[PDB]
Amino acid sequence: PFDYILSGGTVIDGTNAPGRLADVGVRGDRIAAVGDLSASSARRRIDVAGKVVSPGFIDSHTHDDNYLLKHRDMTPKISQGVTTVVTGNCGISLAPLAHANPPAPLDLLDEGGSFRFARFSDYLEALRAAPPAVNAACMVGHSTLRAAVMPDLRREATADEIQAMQALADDALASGAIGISTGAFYPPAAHASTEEIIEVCRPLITHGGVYATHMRDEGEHIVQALEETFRIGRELDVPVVISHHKVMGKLNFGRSKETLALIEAAMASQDVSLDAYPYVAGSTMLKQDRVLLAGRTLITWCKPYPELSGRDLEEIAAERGKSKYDVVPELQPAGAIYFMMDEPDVQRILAFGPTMIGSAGLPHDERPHPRLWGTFPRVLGHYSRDLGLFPLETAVWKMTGLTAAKFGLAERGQVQPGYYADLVVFDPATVADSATFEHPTERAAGIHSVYVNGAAVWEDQSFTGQHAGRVLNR
Ligand SMILES: [Cu+2]
Numbered sequence: 105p106f107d108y109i110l111s112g113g114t115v116i117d118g119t120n121a122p123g124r125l126a127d128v129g130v131r132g133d134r135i136a137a138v139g140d141l142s143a144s145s146a147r148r149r150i151d152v153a154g155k156v157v158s159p160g161f162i163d164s165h166t167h168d169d170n171y172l173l174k175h176r177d178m179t180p181k182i183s184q185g186v187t188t189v190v191t192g193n194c195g196i197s198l199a200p201l202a203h204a205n206p207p208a209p210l211d212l213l214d215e216g217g218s219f220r221f222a223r224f225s226d227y228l229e230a231l232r233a234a235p236p237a238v239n240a241a242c243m244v245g246h247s248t249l250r251a252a253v254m255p256d257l258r259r260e261a262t263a264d265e266i267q268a269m270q271a272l273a274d275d276a277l278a279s280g281a282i283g284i285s286t287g288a289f290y291p292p293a294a295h296a297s298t299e300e301i302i303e304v305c306r307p308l309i310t311h312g313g314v315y316a317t318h319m320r321d322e323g324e325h326i327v328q329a330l331e332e333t334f335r336i337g338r339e340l341d342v343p344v345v346i347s348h349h350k351v352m353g354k355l356n357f358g359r360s361k362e363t364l365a366l367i368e369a370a371m372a373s374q375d376v377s378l379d380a381y382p383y384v385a386g387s388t389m390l391k392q393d394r395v396l397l398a399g400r401t402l403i404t405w406c407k408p409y410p411e412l413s414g415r416d417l418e419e420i421a422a423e424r425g426k427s428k429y430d431v432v433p434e435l436q437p438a439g440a441i442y443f444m445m446d447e448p449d450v451q452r453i454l455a456f457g458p459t460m461i462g463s464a465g466l467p468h469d470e471r472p473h474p475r476l477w478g479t480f481p482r483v484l485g486h487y488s489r490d491l492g493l494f495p496l497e498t499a500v501w502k503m504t505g506l507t508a509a510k511f512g513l514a515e516r517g518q519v520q521p522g523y524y525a526d527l528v529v530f531d532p533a534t535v536a537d538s539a540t541f542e543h544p545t546e547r548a549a550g551i552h553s554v555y556v557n558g559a560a561v562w563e564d565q566s567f568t569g570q571h572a573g574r575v576l577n578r
């Protein structure tokens with residue numbers, strides 16, 4: 105007998121096909137059957153008429169490394185229909201690193217003494233012993249490796265340092281990591297050469313992981329940054345993932361036509377993937393960057409002056425008698441929101457066939473960017489339904505079947521008999537992002553229920569208490 109059957113709704117199976125009326129039966133952690141299940145014995149038959157039953161959403165780009173440990177409920181994500189998170193992005197992973205004051209942007213994951221894992225396996229063991237509500241597919245970050253090995257980060261690494269990082273990377277992959285990420289855009293790795301990155305990531309071909317990256321530059325020199333990424337992919341002969349694709353700065357608006365053309369061409373000869381979030385503003389560490397600081401900038405958190413959280417940097421700078429760029433040093437470490445993208449580009453990038461959906465949420469921020477709470481429903485509601493950017497089945501595919509395939513998450517991302525029971529029940533007519541820049545933590549509308557490995561984790565707009573997540577392997 106099945107444990108339960110979700111009956112009377114429309115199934116959008118995650119393979120990018122129009123929805124069809126069908127029931128979904130679950131037994132244990134597996135989807136036992138799909139179709140007319142009136143003839144199958146079940147302990148419960150849940151009515152989901154008027155709703156859509158789809159695979160659970162996979163967040164391709166998260167910074168939930170530590171949040172998974174400190175807030176197992178994972179409300180910001182499960183309330184949106186997310187059932188699996190990919191961690192350790194942009195070169196930033198919680199482990200391996202025992203440091204009491206990690207350099208920005210590593211501090212985006214810190215709640216105070218959070219970096220206590222000497223080995224990557226110790227981190228994975230912790231997750232398994234006290235599982236979060238969602239599954240976790242973890243990557244190790246290059247900048248974290250640099251911080252753990254190099255006494256001085258403002259220079260290229262020596263052969264001995266490269267060997268040390270490569271050993272740590274290898275141990276992480278052997279322990280279960282699904283890949284390695286880099287973020288040469290940031291201070292900790294700005295001095296890292298392309299060859300340093302290649303040598304540190306060589307274990308990928310032996311273990312079969314992916315290479316993810318926050319490119320060295322996403323503005324004036326984005327073409328060069330794209331080429332470096334493609335080159336790294338060919339040298340390693342491993343798939344590459346371009347994180348949160350965008351063209352930032354007024355002088356780069358409209359250039360998504362150009363960048364997408366380059367990516368499409370690369371996909372013809374090598375393995376390339378990419379993800380993005382549905383907003384015109386970015387967010388990360390407060391940084392002395394003239395392009396990032398060109399437009400409206402809001403503080404998310406500030407260590408030396410906590411009261412600045414939520415304020416407009418222009419006011420702060422002006423009142424201190426300095427430019428936004430010159431006032432940054434005295435306010436660090438801190439975080440911010442940067443309005444430096446244009447709607448047309450965001451829409452073009454989201455619509456681009458292979459683009460997967462990733463939130464890039466920064467969960468520890470005092471006053472966070474709303475993407476943390478509304479990314480997925482904003483794509484299903486605002487963009488798919490209201491603007492008609494793509495049909496619903498395609499919008500779902502972009503956060504389920506496509507993502508599972510690119511990260512190698514076997515038996516997930518599809519509503520198919522035999523696959524794991526990560527599922528979402530939502531109302532297509534009302535699903536929508538409620539979070540706004542003004543009120544960034546509002547819960548999404550239209551999300552009826554969410555299941556992970558067969559257990560309901562979100563019901564009646566609340567965490568059920570089921571710590572059903574598992575550490576996944578590629
Ligand atoms: Cu990131």
Ligand SMILES: [Zn+2]
Nearest residue numbers: 194287318347
């Ligand atoms: Zn990034």
